Amino acid sequence: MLQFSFVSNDVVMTYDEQIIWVWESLNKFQTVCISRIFNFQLQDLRNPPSTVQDFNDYEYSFNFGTLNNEYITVPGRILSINRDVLIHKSIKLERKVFASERNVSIFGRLSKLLDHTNPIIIGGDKPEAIPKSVFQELQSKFPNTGELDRYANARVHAILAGYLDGMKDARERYEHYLNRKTVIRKTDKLDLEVLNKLEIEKYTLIRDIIQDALNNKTNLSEDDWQSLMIPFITLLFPKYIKVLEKVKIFDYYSNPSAKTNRFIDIALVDANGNLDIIEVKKPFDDKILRKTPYRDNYIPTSELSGGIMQAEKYIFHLSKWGVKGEKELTNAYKNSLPAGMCIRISNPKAIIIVGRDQIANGNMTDGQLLDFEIIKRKYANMIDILTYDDLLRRLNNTIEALKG
Template sequence: ELIEAELGKYQLLREMISGWLASSASYSEKDWQRLILKVVLLLLPKYVAVLENVQIIDAYSAPGQKKKRFIDVCLIDAGGNLDVVEVKKPFDDALLSKSLYRGNSIPSKELSGAIMQAEKYLFHLSKWGVDGEAELTKRHAKQLPPAMQIRITNPKALLLLGRDMRHSGAPAFSEQQKFDLEVIKRKYANMMDILTYDDLLRRLDNIIASLSQRRAALA
């Protein structure tokens, strides 16, 4: 019964996201953030809380001054650890530049910008340290499970942007481009997980296939 319930949940999530992608042009970036936030705790069950518009301190951009920065979305896992989420629109050409560098595909301006933005957030969070943990816990206590303390322990980022499949179902990239994109993803794997919307659908497909096999084995 538990497997059946989980299977139904992930099938519904996949149908919802596929439906959103089918009419993606009608949604703004803020719309996409709202849509993903509705389901992110179901998609990523290790997390237990979503924090929006998270204010952090930047003490490095201007020496001697402290600036306020705002992260659109942070997730808190069951241990209280904080991670950063960046949700962008599913543009078809948001990942790789159309020009090559010595025969290699390189990140697009949008992907490079999202990576840099996430890296800065992670940097400022790590430098904020214990004071930041106390401040964020106090500020977002109502959104956390009772008695939970936020921890800034080697935070990571999740970037969700772009597509690697066309609306027709055809691949958006050649085999060489796919390889180069994977190299780019793995370069940053120690600090962030870079996902396309099609990566997300494939992950859901694999979860659904695994649950279906387990259900059949118990039948």
């Protein structure tokens, strides 16, 4: 068990499997590795052990780097990475801080992910520092050997279920809907109560399919998740009439010399003919807010702000593309539309479904719910910013409204 301590300014860890073989490797290569992550040198060793004394009584004293400005500074040659790493005194110096399960280096992937040579700072009051609870979240959800075996087992299960009965979970729910359909529809005459029971069964089917996709189909492609969500967009939002995929729009602002082609992934036409955009994003992470507030205000994530800005680029290119774009989109999609209706670009807006919010089971302050409600109406060209749990809550509220 590696034991960490600090003596005055310097930080001297104690290490205690043959100790004599570690000394022979340190004399042989001039470098030694402790637990396949902590690389060390003879200069990092504070004092050499003598061969006369017992090596088992002696504990190995290695320098972990100097402590400066209230920061345990660990250099890059110890962790075999590019930049240094700074740890605050509030994070206890421990083997599990620098290592994941089955000897996976935590900061090696972080150093491979950062282009800038500026150091990684954990904790404290630095402006570029990572907070403490974000670091425990990174330690809990690191892609270690247990996570990467779980991802590979879930993907191979997802590939093999796609080859045999790819939509068997939605087919069972649709067969349950068809069994509930003939029970409700006893007579061929349609009234308002039987219609309300059929809307209850339809919204229950859509809610159960979306919940079963959230439980089991999260380890899919973005195109596969979108192809899961296409046949229910016009039922969740019955204003819109047609779902259009890979809609080629014209961009003139990113390259001023020549027109660039851009592609809206999912686009929506309502009954008047106006074109709108929906962004159905795959729920990779379970947050809609950053887990620490900036200045006691919770800010949106990079995943939320990426989808808003992509939809705003689509809205910008449609509004700049104008009546030439109206004629081009009504020439591209005249056969798919009902007859007599043309595609119009008249102030297009966007719908964003991103990823989960953890409103349920608690774990949210009134300020967090206030920031989430303010953020869902913050933007100009978004008529709806939804999470997947907001979609399930809207479906549930529509179910108990149609019941009563």
